[PDB]
Scaffold this active site. Structure first.
Site, short mmCIF file in Angstrom:
data_model
loop_
_atom_site.label_atom_id
_atom_site.label_comp_id
_atom_site.label_asym_id
_atom_site.label_seq_id
_atom_site.Cartn_x
_atom_site.Cartn_y
_atom_site.Cartn_z
N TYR A 118 0.82 -1.21 0.00
CA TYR A 118 0.00 0.00 0.00
C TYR A 118 0.86 1.26 0.00
O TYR A 118 1.73 1.42 0.85
CB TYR A 118 -0.87 -0.04 1.25
CG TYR A 118 -2.01 0.96 1.38
CD1 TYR A 118 -3.19 0.79 0.67
CD2 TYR A 118 -1.91 2.02 2.25
CE1 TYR A 118 -4.26 1.70 0.82
CE2 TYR A 118 -2.95 2.93 2.41
CZ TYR A 118 -4.12 2.76 1.70
OH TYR A 118 -5.16 3.66 1.86
N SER A 126 3.83 -6.77 2.14
CA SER A 126 2.69 -6.18 2.85
C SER A 126 1.37 -6.54 2.17
O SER A 126 1.05 -7.73 2.06
CB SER A 126 2.92 -4.68 2.98
OG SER A 126 2.14 -4.13 4.04
N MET A 127 0.54 -5.56 1.75
CA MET A 127 -0.66 -5.94 1.00
C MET A 127 -0.31 -6.72 -0.26
O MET A 127 -1.11 -7.54 -0.73
CB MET A 127 -1.49 -4.71 0.62
CG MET A 127 -2.31 -4.14 1.74
SD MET A 127 -3.41 -2.88 1.05
CE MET A 127 -4.09 -2.25 2.60
N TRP A 147 0.29 -8.88 4.87
CA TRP A 147 -0.92 -8.48 5.58
C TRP A 147 -2.12 -8.75 4.69
O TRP A 147 -2.06 -8.56 3.48
CB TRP A 147 -0.89 -7.01 5.99
CG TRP A 147 -2.15 -6.59 6.71
CD1 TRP A 147 -2.38 -6.65 8.06
CD2 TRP A 147 -3.36 -6.08 6.12
NE1 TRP A 147 -3.65 -6.19 8.34
CE2 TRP A 147 -4.27 -5.84 7.17
CE3 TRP A 147 -3.75 -5.80 4.80
CZ2 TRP A 147 -5.55 -5.33 6.94
CZ3 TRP A 147 -5.02 -5.30 4.58
CH2 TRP A 147 -5.91 -5.07 5.65
N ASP A 183 7.79 -5.33 13.49
CA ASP A 183 6.80 -4.73 12.60
C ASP A 183 5.68 -4.09 13.40
O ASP A 183 5.03 -4.75 14.22
CB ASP A 183 6.24 -5.82 11.69
CG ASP A 183 5.62 -5.27 10.43
OD1 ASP A 183 4.95 -4.21 10.48
OD2 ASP A 183 5.77 -5.92 9.37
N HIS A 204 8.86 -3.02 9.38
CA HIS A 204 8.02 -3.48 8.28
C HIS A 204 8.75 -3.56 6.94
O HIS A 204 8.36 -4.35 6.07
CB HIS A 204 6.82 -2.52 8.16
CG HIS A 204 5.73 -2.99 7.24
ND1 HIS A 204 5.13 -4.23 7.34
CD2 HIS A 204 5.09 -2.34 6.23
CE1 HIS A 204 4.19 -4.33 6.41
NE2 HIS A 204 4.15 -3.21 5.72
#
Length: 263
Positions: free
Chosen positions: A59, A132-133, A157, A178, A209
């Site tokens: 993101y 991540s996303m 995530w 994170d 992260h």
């Protein structure tokens, strides 16, 4: 003889170096189909067709966050496409659709005589990575596309952590500290949910992260594990069984787990 084995026999030193044995070239995808933009990295004279890997950022992020994987993986015998998404605010499900569209375009380019990767790809052997996303999108890709041969998301995530349907061999890079996708509510529940596959959990000690992004301070270990995982499972290459499945026994790693992954 394994028809997919490429390149010299691996050593720890060769897998920890900034680049492997193959020379890497790249190009920008001129008319990207189903995603925002793409860069394709590929090896010269790898000795045969190679598998393809599609890598998606997180993101608000762009290719720069995950770019280092392109040359690193390509230099060991892979075609790699790093993408920008249609919007930087796209959600994981949309990221998965765009990741698969990127793989479809690599397969199309493999048949396009004007493309630099013409005839360079085994389109039956593909993998997915992402941050991540984009890591959640990679797990969604694996769940929806079990013909994929390997997945290796980083700091993943998603709204849901239940990926129990995944049969694709999956390596989860996690970042100990994170605060965006905390390990205890994201990466580790995701890892625990997967009961049907070979899998690995590698948590980077002290990592934020962005601990597996371009410019990170553990490229020797992270790049060794990423290449070894893709070698073992995309190429069925048992020369990499120990590298792919071993505990690094490293102070750089705060948590290591693996299942159905034999030395």
């Amino acid at each position: 003889t394994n028809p997919y084995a490429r390149g010299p026999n691996p050593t720890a030193a060769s897998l920890e170096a900034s680049a492997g044995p193959f020379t890497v070239r790249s190009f920008t995808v001129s008319r990207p189909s189903g995603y925002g933009a793409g860069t394709v990295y590929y090896p010269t004279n790898a000795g045969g067709t190679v598998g393809a890997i599609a890598i998606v950022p997180g993101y608000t992020a762009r290719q720069s966050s995950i770019k280092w994987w392109g040359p690193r993986l390509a230099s060991h015998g892979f075609v790699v496409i790093t993408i920008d998404t249609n919007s930087t605010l796209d959600q994981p499900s949309s990221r998965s659709s765009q990741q698969m569209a990127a793989l479809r375009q690599v397969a199309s380019l493999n048949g396009t005589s004007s493309s630099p990767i013409y005839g360079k790809v085994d389109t039956a052997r593909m993998g997915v990575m992402g941050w991540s996303m984009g890591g959640g999108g990679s797990l969604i890709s694996a769940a929806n596309n079990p013909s994929l041969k390997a997945a290796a998301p980083q700091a993943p995530w998603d709204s849901s952590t239940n990926f129990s349907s995944v049969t694709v061999p999956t390596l989860i890079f996690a970042c100990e500290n994170d605060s965006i996708a905390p390990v205890n509510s994201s990466a580790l529940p995701i890892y625990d949910s997967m009961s049907r596959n070979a899998k690995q959990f590698l948590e980077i000690n002290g990592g934020s992260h962005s601990c597996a992004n371009s410019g990170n301070s553990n490229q020797a270990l992270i790049g060794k594990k990423g290449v070894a995982w893709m070698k073992r499972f995309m190429d069925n290459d048992t020369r990499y069984s120990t590298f792919a499945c071993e505990n690094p026994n490293s102070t750089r790693v705060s948590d290591f787990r693996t299942a159905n992954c034999s030395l």
